[PDB]
């Protein structure tokens, strides 16, 4: 019963067009609660969950401050990136950063994260020890030797093991029903006679939080990676998730196949069989 708080930022330069666009989102577990947008009118960090709204004007002022200043810092960290890579002013470029922190059941810090990615590929990341970097290529090794000389990992480690963890414990209480409900998956099977010697069983798992759910198929207890299609877990729109898994079965042998939904809102794992 460990938890997580994550924060995803994206700088996308638009040469010739405006200043670089900056989007940024915050999550506790799989529940976004804040966002900010450099193209937005308000120019404020905004709320996207009920339990964050109950936060003082003190909060929103300070959160708008740091996000607005990651805004500007990442705009220059894109200009630096060009000079590093000798790149044309013409090109749009993406700089994503991810920072966050995990707590366990108790509330003790478990792990910190802080890292970057230029144009889809890793750039630099803080390793688990919170005292060293992982420089993806050679440009990143410039930043590495520099963030090492400047004891920047020290500074991150004081947010990660401190401030971050606090906000996580807090968010986790202010919203202890959104974030600490485990809504179990709703199960049912469907059956589409395809050709006149085959059929399709689809195992549906709808309405669950959190997203982590396992769906395996079994022909006579043995698991089947074979004639199977398994769609990515996907959002429903309201914070519940849905996944489905389906198998092509020979016609007549519908009940040689069992479906195995394993979610954490389920006391025991669910076996499912056809049955009209």
């Amino acid at each position: 019963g460990s938890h997580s708080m994550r924060y995803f930022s994206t700088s996308v330069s638009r040469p010739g067009r405006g200043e670089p666009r900056f989007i940024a989102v915050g999550y506790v577990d799989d529940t976004q609660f804040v966002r900010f947008d450099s193209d937005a009118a308000s120019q404020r960090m905004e709320p996207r969950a009920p339990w964050i709204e109950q936060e003082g004007p003190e909060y929103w002022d300070e959160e708008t401050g740091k996000v607005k200043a990651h805004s500007q810092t990442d705009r220059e960290n894109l200009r630096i990136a060009l000079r590093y890579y000798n790149q044309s002013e013409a090109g749009s470029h993406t700089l994503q950063m991810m920072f966050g922190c995990d707590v366990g059941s108790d509330g003790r810090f478990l792990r910190g994260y802080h890292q970057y990615a230029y144009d889809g590929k890793d750039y630099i990341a803080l390793k688990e020890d919170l005292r060293s970097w992982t420089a993806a290529d050679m440009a990143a090794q410039i930043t590495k030797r520099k963030w090492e000389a400047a004891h920047v990992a020290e500074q991150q480690r004081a947010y990660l093991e401190g401030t971050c963890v606090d906000g996580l414990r807090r968010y986790l209480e202010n919203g202890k029903e959104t974030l600490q409900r485990t809504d179990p998956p709703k199960t049912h099977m469907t059956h589409h006679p395809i050709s006149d010697h085959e059929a399709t069983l689809r195992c549906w798992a709808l309405g669950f939080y959190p997203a982590e759910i396992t769906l395996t198929w079994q022909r006579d207890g043995e698991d089947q990676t074979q004639d199977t299609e398994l769609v990515e877990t996907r959002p429903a729109g309201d914070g519940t998730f849905q996944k489905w898994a389906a198998v092509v079965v020979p016609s007549g042998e519908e009940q040689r196949y069992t479906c195995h939904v394993q979610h954490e809102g389920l006391p025991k794992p669910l076996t499912l069989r056809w049955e009209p």
Binding site: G26, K66, V152
Partner: peptide, 9 residues
């Protein structure tokens, strides 16, 4: 809480 630090690559 958003990260305070803002270093440059």
């Amino acid at each position: 809480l958003y990260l305070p630090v803002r270093v440059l690559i």
